[PDB]
Amino acid sequence: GLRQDSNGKLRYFDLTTGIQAKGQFVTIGQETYYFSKDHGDAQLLPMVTEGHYGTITTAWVYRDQNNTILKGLQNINGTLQFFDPYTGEQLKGGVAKYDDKLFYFESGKGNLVSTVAGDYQDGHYISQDGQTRYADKQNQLVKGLVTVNGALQYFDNATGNQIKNQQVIVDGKTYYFDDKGNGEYLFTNTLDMSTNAFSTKNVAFNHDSSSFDHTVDGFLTADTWYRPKSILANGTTWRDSTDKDMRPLITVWWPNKNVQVNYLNFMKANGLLTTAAQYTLHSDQYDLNQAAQDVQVAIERRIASEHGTDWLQKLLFESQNNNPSFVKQQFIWNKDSEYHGGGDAWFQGGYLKYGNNPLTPTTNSDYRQPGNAFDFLLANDVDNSNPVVQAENLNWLHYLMNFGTITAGQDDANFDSIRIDAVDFIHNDTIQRTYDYLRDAYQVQQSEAKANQHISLVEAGLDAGTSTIHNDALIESNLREAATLSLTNEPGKNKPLTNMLQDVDGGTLITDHTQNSTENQATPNYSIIHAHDKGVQEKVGAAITDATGADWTNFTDEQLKAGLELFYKDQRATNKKYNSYNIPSIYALMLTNKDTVPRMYYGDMYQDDGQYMANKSIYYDALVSLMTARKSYVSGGQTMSVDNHGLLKSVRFGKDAMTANDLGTSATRTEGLGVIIGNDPKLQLNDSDKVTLDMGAAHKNQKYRAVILTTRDGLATFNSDQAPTAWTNDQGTLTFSNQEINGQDNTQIRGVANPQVSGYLAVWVPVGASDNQDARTAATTTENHDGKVLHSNAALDSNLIYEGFSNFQPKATTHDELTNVVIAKNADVFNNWGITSFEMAPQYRSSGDHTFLDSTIDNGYAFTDRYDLGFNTPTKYGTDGDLRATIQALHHANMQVMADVVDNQVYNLPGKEVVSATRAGVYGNDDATGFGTQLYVTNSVGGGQYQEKYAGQYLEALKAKYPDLFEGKAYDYWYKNYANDGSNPYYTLSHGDRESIPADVAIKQWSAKYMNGTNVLGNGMGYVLKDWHNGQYFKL
Ligand SMILES: [Ca+2]
Ligand code: NA
């Protein structure tokens, strides 16, 4: 070990190999020394006790017992650190010179971990032989572990090839080098194990499963206990082990030196070793190994004293004194070694993509191809490319589309249509096959009569190319996004309303409102401003976190209630910090524009500081008046322009009048409407200027009356002809000005700032409609020949969807407050507004696990058992009985009912397995991180009682009735291409070929073989134990 030479100089010789230590640091008993690179002579580095870490103008520094700033190399608390010799600023993640040699100080704590061969600033990279290399100032290849322009980097010693996206062992230390070759230290490896007689007795009794616990799929974990050959009873007397003897693996074996060091120091601090001896990353391994064997003595004495091991379970594996457990304190066994986050880690810290390993035959897969623009989002990502999962998705769809029949023999209690949740995150083949189901079951492709009985929609725009190719479902129009530019912002922050003249998705036209006199041209679409998520969840989220301090995905009912109070107070004020401006105007656009199906959001009409439908919003009357006027008056062609005062003027002509010169039928006279919208609350007209609405040739010399007028304090609303009136001239033009018409207040145009309008809003309809005029157009049975399921025409436009929930509804405190009970009770209210399609929330039982917003407010999107729609105990919305009664009531009130189909993910599956994992982002793209690729313990097995009962149960019958669904099939779809030069995305026609699928394999419970991946779980890169020297996993 430590030995003096002839002259009394101290030198060090490794305790196992006998190799002299030179140019390195060694801890010996209590002291840490450096041994010079020349003669190997010792220099004692004094232990710094007392003193504290601080800051300076902001840079961390370290001050001694009496407050002096320390400079240079320092031995602090059994670590070596380096502080700039001028500023005293601590170095972290870089090199410093000592003894004219370079040492690296890791980025986490600034601890000295290694020697670096050289530091380079003046050479240059080259490409040779298909590799990247680095040439120094003399144009000579650089080799080994070096720093280049301040980055730690590694060039293969033999070739000079730079290493990228790999973990590399250099001189006994393990590093990761990223996609640019930029490195980071991970851990110091253990040299080699004791081979004394003591160690031979710690060896495992055998390799059988019964010798180890906390195993998964035959692999060992950090939590594993094992049966040794022998037990040092009470620390003194070796005996053969029995089948009742188990000891933690981590009392005898460590994955790296950091963990062994931390282990000895932890056991020190908890009374199982007392010694002046310091244990550091510079300790001789021989001493560390012996120290661990000595801790065993003290462990065995305490096991004899306490007649058991429960104290040791707690000591190593539970939180003690509000600290993480010993295991969880270790880098390789915690989230720090998973490198969470990144721009592609949209939720939950990001994702782990599953792959294959020869040692994991039960979780391997031949599939896992995303087959769409996106892959991961949340929780356990379902592999919807897998043929067995595709069959299961058809099973579940059929279940939902026959839920009343299936569960109660009630054929009037089944869902009619679907929303495809997270459509761009699931494989195109399952989307195409889903649309074939609906074609097979309901003949939607035969005519609008059938298609319009089953109006489905997806959560995407024009990028949902499987949905647009044959318009099997509505895509979302660009109105929301356009309105967010020009209407929803505070004064001074809106763009001009000219962006509302065309509805355009990344440069592609969905529909043009300017002079729309045609049909069957627009892409069938739905228009919204808000939804349960969109435009909402992160604004409430901010009132919550602001009033409370909680995070937007995880809070208590009490903190939520508080945030909602602030939220609604803000909503009802003119000056809004959290809430959207101009909401009634935007609804006016939605509810009068041609060539769309509008969707009403529940939360724009009702407030979540009340139970379902209890508290009307400030906008409620305006939206009711607009839905009422839509049903009575809205039909025919559209025109739209923005005048010289910035006012948007939108006219609908009435039934059968497509252009401004058409006369239509006798019905036309009393149909049509005009809308004037401004976004300038300071608008003032001069005395001579006019604002005109050109109502058209069917509306000459005609009396109009208001639906909506802008007032000082809000909006005046009128649902009858008893309203202020105005007259068209002999050309059909209504004329407004800065003066009132016939002394009628609020008939003049002027900008206004108030809680319901920030700019100007007026809606005018012809006087004289009969009490139940209905300007809607019925669907016909005429056959389609163009290949499209939905067609954007007067009949499709006559539909109206209601999204009948909000995330932030409170839990019901009584049966009568339950959402689904209240919906059934109020079914005629929806009919009277003209709702034709009732979009219910996802009805699946919430996992309740608080791992995301959806599983904290229990909205139905985060579930374990996708067949459990409220059996035994209710969901947030009611029981399975309450659901059937709701669907019944809606149907008897002439509405279709939408099932929110969530194929993307499953939450909270308790059964564990082991699968190969790499970090990935939403796109399914591998991230270059330190975690690399590791076997990983996943929470991947489960489902629930209803998945067990129903999954796969319908497949044999479905293959008999609709055999085509189980065949392979060629199909086309549109594919969104993004341009290099920053010009608009463009669409190309892709071909797909879905596989044949089986009907005889059920997914009764989920497992990893059927998943693409999972959100990161925080277990670490090395929770599944292996030999880090050679990468070999332990396996029973
Ligand atoms: Ca997915
Ligand atoms: Na050694």
Coordinates of N, CA and C and ligand atoms in Angstrom, one line a residue, residues 374-377 381-384 422 425-427 903-905 1012, ligand 1:
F374 N -47.2 11.0 -35.3 CA -46.8 10.9 -33.9 C -47.0 9.5 -33.4
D375 N -46.4 9.3 -32.2 CA -46.3 8.0 -31.7 C -46.8 8.1 -30.2
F376 N -46.0 8.7 -29.3 CA -46.2 8.7 -27.9 C -46.9 10.0 -27.4
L377 N -47.6 9.9 -26.3 CA -48.3 11.0 -25.8 C -48.3 10.9 -24.2
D381 N -48.4 3.4 -24.1 CA -48.8 3.6 -25.5 C -49.1 2.3 -26.2
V382 N -50.4 2.2 -26.7 CA -50.9 1.0 -27.3 C -50.3 0.8 -28.7
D383 N -49.8 -0.4 -29.0 CA -49.3 -0.7 -30.4 C -50.4 -1.0 -31.4
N384 N -51.0 0.0 -31.9 CA -52.1 -0.2 -32.8 C -51.7 -0.7 -34.2
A422 N -56.9 11.6 -30.3 CA -55.4 11.5 -30.6 C -55.1 10.7 -31.9
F425 N -51.8 10.0 -33.4 CA -50.9 9.2 -32.5 C -51.1 7.7 -32.6
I426 N -51.9 7.3 -33.5 CA -52.3 5.9 -33.7 C -52.0 5.5 -35.1
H427 N -51.7 4.2 -35.3 CA -51.4 3.7 -36.7 C -52.5 3.9 -37.6
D903 N -58.0 5.0 -28.5 CA -57.2 3.8 -28.7 C -55.7 4.0 -28.4
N904 N -55.3 5.3 -28.1 CA -53.9 5.6 -28.0 C -53.2 4.9 -26.8
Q905 N -53.8 5.0 -25.6 CA -53.1 4.6 -24.4 C -54.0 4.0 -23.3
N1012 N -46.3 0.0 -27.5 CA -45.1 0.7 -28.1 C -44.1 1.1 -27.0
Ligands
CA1 CA -49.6 6.0 -29.9

